[PDB]
Amino acid sequence: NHNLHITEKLEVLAKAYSVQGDKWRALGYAKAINALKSFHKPVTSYQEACSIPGIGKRMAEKIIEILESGHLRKLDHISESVPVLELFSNIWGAGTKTAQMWYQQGFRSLEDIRSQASLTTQQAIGLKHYSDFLERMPREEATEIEQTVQKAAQAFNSGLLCVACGSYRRGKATCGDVDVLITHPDGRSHRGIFSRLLDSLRQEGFLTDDLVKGETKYLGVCRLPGPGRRHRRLDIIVVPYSEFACALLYFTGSAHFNRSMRALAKTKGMSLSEHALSTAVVGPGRVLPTPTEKDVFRLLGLPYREPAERDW
DNA sequence: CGGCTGTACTG
DNA sequence: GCCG
Length: 312
Ligand SMILES: [Cl-]
Ligand SMILES: [Cl-]
Ligand code: NA
Hints:
With 312 residues, this protein is an alpha+beta fold.
């Protein structure tokens, strides 16, 4: 990580682009920043800069200004709105467009939002849990959340598999949120469970707010019982057994891992989703058999990677 | 020039 | 932003 002196300046620029909705430029910055964060030695030569994949002409030119001047002149033309747009867009359910609208309307603080903004149902929940949603949890707590869902689900059928995915499954010490993936080996007994499970978890007082209720995926808010507990983001997903491996892969991530794998599948005339690895349409396309995650890797001509190896 | 992943909610 |  011999990077700090350059990346710190780039991240400021990156975040500005992000919160103002210039997602593609922010992507380039993210990737560039990630590369610098993983190069063996500190960057010295302009040519050395280009030498790195993810860093090109313009990023090189910028890195050179940092190494020399110790300051990047672009960081001075960042709209003063940025901190407020970040503040506003950290409300779950409010993105760049909402943040900008609120800013235009003269709002500057969460007090302004609370007292004067018209909030969607999701945004009101997001504001209520503003601080909690910015907090990570120790992985031990993710374990408890998993078991809470598992115990509730297994009440309906002891054969149900319940797996917490995301950074938890990638073996991280802390987790931003928990995704519990649920299926049944017999390809059938997963049906019916979804709505009953949610209602059970709600009656138990575990689910405190619902954000999105989809057909097979729920997004909401949970809190474990007892003192000193925070509200945590929880998704619960139910999939037929045939999708298990692709869903494990997707819900495990990371984000960059997922997009890279999808990009690779596309180069090979395939398409990869949380549902299946398919032949490209580029009729509709054929679902390729993938009973395990290894199968997805092999079909893409990749050696298997354990969840901890997918933390990109 | 233009893709940069592919999915599924809300209202 | 990067890159084919
Ligand atoms: Cl542009
Ligand atoms: Cl595992
Ligand atoms: Na948000």
